[PDB]
Specification:
Protein name (chain B): Glycosyl transferase, group 1 family protein
GO molecular function, one term (chain B): glycosyltransferase activity
Number of strands of chain A: 23
Organism (chain B): Staphylococcus aureus (strain USA300)
Number of helices of chain A: 16
CATH class of one domain in chain A: Alpha Beta
Oligomer: 2 chains of a larger assembly
Pfam families (chain B): Glycos_transf_1
Largest sheet of chain A: 10 strands, antiparallel
CATH architecture of one domain in chain A: 3-Layer(aba) Sandwich
Helix content of chain A: 25-40%
Shape of chain A: globular
Strand order of the largest sheet of chain A: 4-5-6-7-8-9-10-11-12-13
CATH superfamily of one domain in chain A: Glycogen Phosphorylase B
Distance between the termini of chain A: 14 Å
Keywords (chain B): Glycosyltransferase, Nucleotide-binding, Transferase
Largest interface: A-B, 30 and 31 residues
Radius of gyration of chain A: 27 Å
Chain lengths: 490, 494
């Protein structure tokens, strides 16, 4: 039996949903449940984006599947520049080349590398210099898609190839929308009107009696699951707030990304959310129509670095976005620095709010007190001397960063806001929950913990215990039980 | 060494050039010189058109060559209907008064299928539709059974590009089109050959590449459809030996031998004579005019375009074997009979052929009250019975070409009276031997000579025996010896 985590693709910069999908995959292998990520969109760079995260045998892409290129890795590098000159006697006028036969302009080639071992695309031109066809190469080496052009470089149709160059899919477009898809599969021809129908066909070929699907990128996967039969079991996973407005729990419309899932609840064996708090809201909102279950989106990893070697160092691990209200922590430091002259705030993240935050810092002469540290891929060394974590957001989700900092014995002072802080913070155990936007009470609890390092030490010991509760193995056992119960009942 | 006779195609009704190519192949086969016909145009019916006349190994079509379908014969039949119904689970709906079926996956219209035969054994094409019932692609099947070409459509079913396949389904050629004067014109051709890709701007360049792939030292090419074949040979090296074959008059105006422009179909060959080893024409008379016109720059050789039951069992039966076209001037034959019937009341004239002039010919027949004297007999595939009682053949044309029809009537002992016009009458008529030649458009002299042969049956008999003797000069064995000597000589000089 196989567990499939259905997203869309993998960017250069992995997204929350992509990490969750990958994170969840690792856990299933650990406990000896087979699992695979399922990708939908055509992405001739997928194998590259995947390389530093999962193996080729750990994912099935829908286009790779019909192009017979699943589990296929990089071809041995190919000398395109040599083949064009030494075998085809063409003329190259320079990571782009213009290919001429004698005086005749044929093609526009585009490479990735300056070593020219990885071809990207080749534009083909007619006798009038009209661009008639584009050849799009997969990062693994084989020609993946040719696009036929008409009029003003308008896409008319696309042909997708297997590695050996057989046609496996055809797409036909009008204005640029798909009106027809042809697939060559199982020694015949299949016809679809759109990519959702193709996706549904793909899911039916994947499924074997006893497998389980997870719907992770609902804006794409729910419409696909909606056209598959009810004998194929699938669970919906929400990675965010389920409604546009969390303060109108009964009334708020579902997020657009979750609409097609919520409007066909009966198709799904369950909904998974990250927090008990979110499970209670969702359960009540859908009148218990299907099971809702809370399974955290990560775990506290075993500690490899020195812990609480304690200058008072406060930290923020948070995207530089409006919702994290990070200026409130700069203002906190403005207040505290008169009582705590050697105080330091380190804020780890990136995003829109950098310029404004940077300006607020210079404005208050806090350049020796508050540091916008940007993104660090490794935070282990940053936690060893951290006195406490701050959360000043108007909204949250289950925070992997918070779990990591707790596993390092760094206690946390957070607003009590949905979702995540209530799950990972017990007041006076591993930190303190504060009424949302009460900056005065924030100052009082931060000052109190700084004034009483015996308190910080005791909250440190609570932090290590809270992290122990969210271990890799507790999370394994929760996935293991859920999967067996969902399949048992199906 | 291989002799290659390069034409365009074979139609369902063979043209003059197609027959000339096939007759030449048959002579080379009898002789023991390897020959093949070479065809250029994409023609997914070529195999059926060819079956009555040549074997698969007797020809190489250009498209078949690149489609890895040269020498391929017919597939065992395939019941597309059962495969669509039983194996694909599609819904078939017959179209009223047709061999056509609409194909559906449930409520969804997917394809329109056309069969050649009401038994649905020969799939011809399949049209594909998108979700908005736009016709996006047409699949064209070869008569041998394989999918030959897919054509991709845009806008009002305009041809954008075409993909040509081997029998296994691999793409071997692509063609890209742009519209000019309301018709698609090739702007690009890609060919997958010898594990490489090759690029061309037009079919002339593709043709030249094809010739270069066939040629081995010792081989010899004949350019028979010069409007297409000459521009192709013009793009090939002079190391490849090619003979130009003219199948009609070489100039637009036969009466200005020196100054007339060449026929548009021969312009490319005459504007590059030094490319060609020789020119072949069907008549000694055309040979002398062409040699003079080109100042003997290359050799010109006349080789007839073809070779030659009970006989002369004799009512007085005149015959005309001639297209009903204005150049033939068949009205003059009506006028001749109008004048003759007075003196010869048991006279008949049988006119074998067809064309746009039939209506006027019937009007004149009716006008002259000649309905029991002049017969418009239509085309006749076989004329053997029609010859046995024929007294005399008539030719009243203002222009001619070498006539296999006239050769055949001469083999059957039928003498002829013809206007003296170029080309063909002087080749097959020696005055007072097998017939008479009359000043062009001299209807009085035509009457007088026709009347003299009717009034002298012993003269008719001598001319008949001269017709048998004239035809025997065009024997299979004399054509073989001309062709054998020509190829020997051409290859020695090259």
């Amino acid at each position: 039996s196989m567990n499939y985590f259905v997203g869309n693709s993998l960017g250069v910069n992995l997204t929350g949903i992509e990490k969750a999908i990958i994170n969840r995959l690792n856990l299933f292998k650990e406990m000896g449940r087979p699992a695979q990520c399922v990708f939908l969109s055509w992405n001739r760079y997928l194998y590259r984006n995947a390389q530093n995260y999962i193996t080729s045998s750990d994912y099935i892409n829908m286009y790779d599947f019909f192009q017979e290129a699943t589990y296929l890795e990089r071809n041995e590098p190919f000398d395109w520049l040599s083949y064009w000159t030494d075998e085809c006697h063409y003329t190259l006028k320079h990571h782009d080349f213009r290919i001429y036969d004698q005086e005749r302009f044929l093609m526009y080639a585009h490479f990735q590398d300056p070593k020219y071992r990885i071809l990207d695309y080749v534009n083909h031109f007619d006798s009038q210099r009209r661009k008639v066809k584009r050849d799009f190469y997969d990062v693994r080496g084989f020609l993946s898609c040719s696009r036929i052009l008409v009029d003003k470089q308008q896409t008319l149709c696309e042909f997708f190839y297997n590695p050996e160059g057989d046609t496996k899919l055809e797409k036909y477009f009008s204005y640029p929308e798909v009106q027809k898809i042809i697939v060559y599969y199982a020694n015949k021809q299949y016809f679809f009107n759109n990519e959702t129908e193709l996706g549904a066909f793909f899911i039916k070929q994947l499924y074997q009696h006893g497998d389980l699907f997870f719907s992770d990128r609902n804006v794409y996967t729910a419409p696909i699951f909606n056209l598959t039969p009810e004998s194929i079991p699938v669970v919906a996973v929400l990675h965010s707030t389920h409604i546009k407005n969390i303060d109108a729990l009964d009334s708020s419309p579902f997020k657009n990304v979750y609409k097609a899932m919520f409007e066909n609840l009966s198709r799904y064996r369950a909904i998974i959310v990250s927090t008990e708090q979110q499970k209670l809201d969702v359960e009540k909102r859908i009148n218990h129509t299907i099971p809702v279950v809370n399974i955290p989106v990560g775990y506290s990893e075993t500690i490899d670095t020195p812990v609480q070697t304690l200058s008072v160092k406060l930290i923020s691990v948070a995207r530089y976005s409006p919702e994290k209200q990070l200026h409130q922590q700069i203002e906190l430091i403005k207040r505290l620095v008169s009582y705590v002259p050697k105080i330091e705030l380190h804020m780890y993240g990136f995003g829109s709010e950098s310029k404004k935050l940077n300006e607020l810092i210079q404005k208050y002469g806090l350049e020796n007190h508050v540091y916008l540290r940007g993104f660090l891929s490794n935070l282990d060394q940053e936690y060893s001397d951290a006195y406490l974590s701050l959360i000043t957001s108007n909204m949250e989700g289950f925070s992997l960063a918070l779990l990591e900092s707790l596993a390092h014995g760094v206690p946390v002072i957070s607003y009590d806001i949905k979702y995540g802080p209530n799950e990972l913070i017990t007041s006076d155990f591993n930190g303190y929950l504060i009424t949302k936007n009460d900056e005065d009470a924030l100052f009082d609890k931060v000052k109190y913990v700084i004034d009483h390092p015996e308190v910080q030490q005791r909250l440190s010991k609570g932090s290590l215990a809270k992290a122990q509760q969210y271990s890799k193995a507790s999370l394994i056992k929760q996935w293991d039980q859920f999967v067996r119960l969902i399949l048992e009942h199906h």
